[PDB]
Amino acid sequence: VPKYLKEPVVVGYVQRDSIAQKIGIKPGDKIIKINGYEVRTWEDLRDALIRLSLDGVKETTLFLERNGEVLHLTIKVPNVQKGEELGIAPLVKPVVGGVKKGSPADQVGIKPGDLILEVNGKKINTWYELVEEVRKSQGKAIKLKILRGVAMPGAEDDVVMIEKELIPAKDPKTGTYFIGLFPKTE
């Protein structure tokens, strides 16, 4: 049933004290191979991990893409008969669902439906990455690259790329730096 099964393995979140956290997987990583097994989809990763564990393999190579490069890690294979998990969740695509009125993002004209491609020159894949980069900004200027669909009377939508610089503000809700963006979650 769950839709993510057929999707690429882009990591949206890494659980505290998981195998994934301990071996150094990060939100935004894309898992592409383990031992072997090609990883195209989450279902591929699930089935690979199950088989490895049934075969007694205790640790193996994990390959992933981070910031446009391929890294390899040594991963502890979770024990399927103990119901152990790796500790990763699927992505939240970095499409803007809401903009807080008056926020830094609203001030630079970011709109619902914008796709955030890049933060501080680095490509992002999942929302949490934007959250963490902004949190770490210390209130200093950050740069975003956005893609925006543009209506063209009597023709298909076009797309434009815009680069924007803004200063994160501290959010009185959380006490962390933010820019006033919220993702589409449907």
Side-chain angles (χ1 to χ4, degrees), residues 1-34 36-186:
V1 190
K3 171 288 298 250
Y4 78 86
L5 279 175
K6 280 323 200 276
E7 302 295 351
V9 185
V10 176
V11 175
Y13 194 83
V14 185
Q15 287 212 72
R16 194 194 321 261
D17 307 312
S18 55
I19 288 162
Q21 193 231 301
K22 286 191 211 319
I23 75 163
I25 297 166
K26 309 179 102 43
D29 288 350
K30 185 169 176 220
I31 298 163
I32 68 178
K33 190 178 180 167
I34 184 174
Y37 298 88
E38 298 304 309
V39 174
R40 263 217 311 120
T41 69
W42 278 95
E43 162 182 25
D44 282 346
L45 176 63
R46 178 196 59 189
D47 292 353
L49 287 169
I50 290 173
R51 184 72 223 192
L52 285 161
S53 167
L54 290 177
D55 288 344
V57 181
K58 255 184 277 270
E59 74 181 27
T60 195
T61 297
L62 182 75
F63 290 92
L64 60 81
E65 186 170 54
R66 174 179 310 164
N67 202 35
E69 287 210 331
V70 173
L71 303 181
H72 51 103
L73 300 184
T74 298
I75 191 216
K76 158 179 215 288
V77 170
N79 199 319
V80 70
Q81 288 179 240
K82 312 192 328 166
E84 197 181 10
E85 307 185 343
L86 184 51
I88 52 174
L91 90 180
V92 166
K93 193 183 171 186
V95 181
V96 174
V99 184
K100 180 177 181 38
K101 192 210 194 85
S103 65
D106 184 37
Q107 286 168 60
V108 290
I110 300 169
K111 273 74 164 77
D114 286 352
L115 176 64
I116 313 303
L117 287 176
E118 287 189 3
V119 184
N120 292 328
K122 287 172 140 41
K123 184 169 225 85
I124 67 151
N125 286 124
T126 194
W127 193 257
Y128 201 52
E129 282 172 277
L130 171 62
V131 178
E132 288 271 64
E133 267 305 288
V134 173
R135 265 171 194 173
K136 289 172 177 139
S137 69
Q138 299 170 330
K140 293 174 346 158
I142 64 142
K143 307 205 133 172
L144 306 178
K145 186 144 92 178
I146 75 94
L147 196 75
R148 175 166 308 158
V150 162
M152 304 293 306
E156 292 192 0
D157 270 14
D158 212 337
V159 176
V160 295
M161 176 282 303
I162 312 177
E163 271 180 316
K164 298 192 169 283
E165 185 177 54
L166 52 48
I167 294 180
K170 225 178 222 178
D171 170 23
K173 283 167 200 287
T174 65
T176 59
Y177 287 97
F178 91 145
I179 56 162
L181 288 183
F182 306 88
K184 278 199 190 171
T185 53
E186 313 107 66

